[PDB]
Amino acid sequence: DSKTVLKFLITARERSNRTFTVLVTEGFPNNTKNAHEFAKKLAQHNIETLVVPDSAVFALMSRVGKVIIGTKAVFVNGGTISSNSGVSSVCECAREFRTPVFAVAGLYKLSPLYPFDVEKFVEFGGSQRILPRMDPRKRLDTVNQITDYVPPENIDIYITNVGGFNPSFIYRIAWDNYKQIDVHLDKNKA
Amino acid sequence: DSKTVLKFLITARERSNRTFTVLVTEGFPNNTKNAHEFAKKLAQHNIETLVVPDSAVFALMSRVGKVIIGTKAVFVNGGTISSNSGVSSVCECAREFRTPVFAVAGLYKLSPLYPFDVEKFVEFGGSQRILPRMDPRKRLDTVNQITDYVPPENIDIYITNVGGFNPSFIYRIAWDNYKQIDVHLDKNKA
Amino acid sequence: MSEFNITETYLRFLEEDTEMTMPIAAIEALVTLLRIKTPETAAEMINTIKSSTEELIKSIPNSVSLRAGCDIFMRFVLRNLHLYGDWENCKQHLIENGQLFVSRAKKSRNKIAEIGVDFIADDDIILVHGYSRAVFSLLNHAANKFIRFRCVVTESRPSKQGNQLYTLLEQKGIPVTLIVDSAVGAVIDKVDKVFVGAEGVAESGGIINLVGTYSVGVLAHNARKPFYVVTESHKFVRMFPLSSDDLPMAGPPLDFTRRTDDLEDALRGPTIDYTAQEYITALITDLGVLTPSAVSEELIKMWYD
Amino acid sequence: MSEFNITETYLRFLEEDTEMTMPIAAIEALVTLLRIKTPETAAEMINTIKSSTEELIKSIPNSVSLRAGCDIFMRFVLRNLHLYGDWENCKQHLIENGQLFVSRAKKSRNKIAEIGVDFIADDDIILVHGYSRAVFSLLNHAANKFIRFRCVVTESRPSKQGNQLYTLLEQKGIPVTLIVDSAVGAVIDKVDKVFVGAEGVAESGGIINLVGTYSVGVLAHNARKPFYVVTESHKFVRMFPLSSDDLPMAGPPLDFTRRTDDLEDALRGPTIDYTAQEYITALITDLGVLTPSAVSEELIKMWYD
């Protein structure tokens, strides 16, 4: 669910003629209305694609040479905040197999903040669409997650519109586009 | 320079029809009269082969999915003693990229000894064929090596004629074919 | 008329307060040097302060915080020597800048807490190492914030500093234990976050404080617990080692001599280790939260020419 | 007529020699139990020795070497109960086997050295941890072999054992220093080989001895220096933990209580850690050099049924 990776993976076949294939997992139950649309849009421009589910990505992790992340926001660590789900663990399986991890990102997606407490920057969603029983009285509690954080250690490079950058060189782009003053953007200076 | 890997990599194409290719490095200046013969014997049965040199194996280590070792002798650790050279470092680059490492070995190649001091079980050769200048009076000293040890940590599985075994399960095959008495095989019991 | 060298000015006010530390004491002594000894010429002023910094390093060499203070003083007199006031105002302009450190660096330690309280979240068991008083300046405001946490304090063999924290924040009212320094690996599987405090920052981000912060750092990496370090902005130093071995204490870290009759045998290995930039993950200064490549740039820009 | 329980037989001969250790003292006490108290019936013999092993564990629980000795004694009386002598000879046959441990396990420690001298090669700086006397039984024959090496001895906080080695092999004439236990990470880049000694071996190969052998093990792994352990064959124990936390001492390893007035604060964390099978790479027993999966098989075969 990122238009950046979609336009890039179309234009990698449209102008350049680099043929490849793209495994894609679904972030059930969020990207399962998007990953199939993603595969449809890539099969219209017919790049050899195939959909894996979430549980079957470690078996196919040894075959794949590279992952790529279309993120939502990226902090001064390079610890980004992504789309719907999946990426907190599949990027970890990428790091453990020493597989490189990309991250395309627009320059507006930056943030001069810091992940102080990481759960506060993570949007846990609703428990409706992970079990549609709606258990009345037995009522087994459950947890959903619509935001997966990655740390900068698991991630390898940042492809932005102003060049390629290390995860340990995301602070200086922020201070090239932000100041020291508006990070505690609050009139009540405590 | 192992007939085991040669017969196996011929019969993997002769009976079974699994097509692949084989990168091969030369152990200069020892396997350079053998690795080219190895490539000739594989090109006669035409399995897509290509020769890399020693220095160009880290660049091509990311592409390759697997190495294989035709060893000479293997101890009770699984720390084997190989042929001419190369394998003390390219197996390390395999371990660091989390690439699996095979080791085919006949059952007679076992040894119930232990690598007590690892240099004593390593055959350093002669300095003639690494610089043919034969420097008379300037006489820059130099070192050759005709035996590369691997530890059991860098190695992954042992393919023997009695099944596949862990590197941490090589002791029990030895005690299934040797005894406690003939490891200090010496009349002068000190 | 004092001479400002060893103890006729410097070591006197170290007995005035056991809250001021070594580098800002060095800053205070070096500014009160030329606050009085200013013989109306730009030549011998810098000779006097360079001679004073080198004899003050010559006093105690194994306390590298002193080198950090005595070299950021040189950066202060260089940038205040810049703006080019033709030395006519700078005899007054530099000295009226002057005490802005003892009005600034003295009150930096609560400015540390105002940005570092929002790290220790609810119910975080915390590991600290050594008497690093900026860590306690964070923890004091954390406990005054009424946030719920627990602390674990290591030993500081042989430098005794670990016994001070358990008699420091216990009486503040925090549930705290005192682990022994060798027991880190059996407990760091349970410790949520680990703080240390530096006695120096190298040109890449390094912890040059105590005996075993490299050991607790490499335990933090192979437990994958975040390894933060609380410091402040008078702790930058040019000294950039490459090994895990710094300048020596008096000989190598591996002695093999002979004890004569009954001399001391504990302090025979090293006492100040080094941590590479990989093991630290975020450091805290007056300049905000600061990733180690940012502290590398900040110490790479003000030290080149 | 002694009752063999606590100190009327056991703790007496611990004062006879400060060279015998705990588990073979337990073996000696348990064989001299039924060497005299043998009331001509196979029923109450085993009840007596099982009661004696459980009360002897009940005496001192936190010395798990005792559990190893008191359980290999049960393996001895089980296999000597096997071969099925109809109990008619076994009243004499078992007791004439009897003292074969105190003729066997007492002289096992030089049998350790006869196979472990060929590990410490020429000019190897050696790291040992804690007073593990089988390591010194190897090192004594190593120095008597006239081979050239150097040794480094860690602290053993809080159990004091590191001060004993520097007053043990110095007078033998070996160049040795005493590092502090927190300084491992700054020196283990230089140490060639590291030895420890176990107070127990789990069902996978584990080191259940002291405060921080897991810390020195994980330092040995991230320096990629070989981590050997010298032990002997009366140290096998059934206790197979899964965490880095064993049976407790008296409470959890993370206390958070209140010191009342001035009670002791050093021993507040754990004191016996655990090492997984990955960090050890070869262990030494009477059974030869022994990879940890081999010690797992050796402790997996004699403990099943």
Residue numbers in the entry:
A (entry chain F), B (entry chain E): 192 to 381
C (entry chain B), D (entry chain A): 1 to 305
Sentences from the paper on this structure:
Eukaryotic protein synthesis typically begins with a specialised initiator methionyl transfer RNA (Met-tRNAi) that is delivered to ribosomes by the translation factor eIF2 as part of a larger preinitiation complex (PIC) with multiple other translation initiation factors. Only by re-engaging with GTP can eIF2 participate in further rounds of Met-tRNAi binding and protein synthesis initiation. Here we have used single-particle electron cryomicroscopy (cryoEM) to resolve the structures of eIF2αP/eIF2B and eIF2/eIF2B complexes from Saccharomyces cerevisiae to an average resolution of 3.9 and 4.6 Å, respectively.
The final model shows two eIF2αγ complexes with a minimal eIF2β NTD helix, each bound at one side of a central eIF2B decamer. The resolution varies from 3.5 Å at the core to 18 Å at the periphery. In contrast, each eIF2γ makes looser or transient contact with one adjacent lateral eIF2Bγε arm (see below). eIF2γ is the GDP/GTP binding subunit and is orientated so that the nucleotide-binding surface faces inwards towards eIF2B. The regulatory phosphoserine (serine 52 in S. cerevisiae and Homo sapiens eIF2α) sits in a conserved loop within domain 1 (residues 48–57) that contributes to the interface with eIF2B and is well resolved. Ser52 itself does not contribute directly to the interface with eIF2B, and the phosphate remains surface exposed. The positively charged side chains R54 and R64 are angled towards Ser52(P) and likely help stabilise this conformation of this important loop of eIF2α. However, in eIF2Bα side chains of T41 and E44 contact eIF2α D84 and Y82, respectively (non-H atoms are within 4 Å).
